[PDB]
Amino acid sequence: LYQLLDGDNTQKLFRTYDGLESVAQKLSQDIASMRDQLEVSEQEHSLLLS
Amino acid sequence: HAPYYGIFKGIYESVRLPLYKAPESVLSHVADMKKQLFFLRSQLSSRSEAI
Amino acid sequence: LQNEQEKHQEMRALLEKQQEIYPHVLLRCLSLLRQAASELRLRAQSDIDRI
């Protein structure tokens, strides 16, 4: 699960459960942030069209 | 009362996976989320180029 | 639910295509009107009316 979330084979010598929850929160935040950017971009596009 | 219940409860809530779902679904779900992230990035890039 | 999600993705793809074509068509119309205003009304026709 940690490998799936961090992508980076950075052989972190010590994986913690708290670290796992943090990386999971980051993915959710990244998706939310990307959706917000897309929404902004959609507004920008709509303004240009208007 | 399982020792790791509190930690995984937190992980389920972070990835927005419902608590009633089977534990075998957690990795598949996270993989799909990553897939979605890639798709959203591609859409943003396409839209930014179009604008 | 799975079918409706697939339909959603298709509709979304179509919407994105239409949003890409529409502004270009508006720009072509604007370009034609600009030509009529600048080259015909302010220049060609104004000279004719004076003479």
Curated annotation (Swiss-Prot), chain A:
Q: What is the scientific name of the source organism?
A: Xenopus laevis (African clawed frog)
Write out the function statement from the record.
Answer: Contributes to mitotic spindle assembly, maintenance of centrosome integrity and completion of cytokinesis as part of the HAUS augmin-like complex.
Family recorded in the similarity comment: Belongs to the HAUS3 family.
Gene that encodes the chain: haus3
Q: What binding partners and quaternary form does the record give?
A: Component of the HAUS augmin-like complex. The complex interacts with the gamma-tubulin ring complex and this interaction is required for spindle assembly.
The protein's superkingdom reads Eukaryota
Protein name, please?
A: HAUS augmin-like complex subunit 3
Localization, per the record, is:
Cytoplasm, Cytoskeleton, Microtubule organizing center, Centrosome; Cytoplasm, Cytoskeleton, Spindle
Coiled-coil residue windows: 15-46
Q: Which residues of the full protein are shown?
A: 449 to 498 of 597
**Any transmembrane segments, and where?**
none
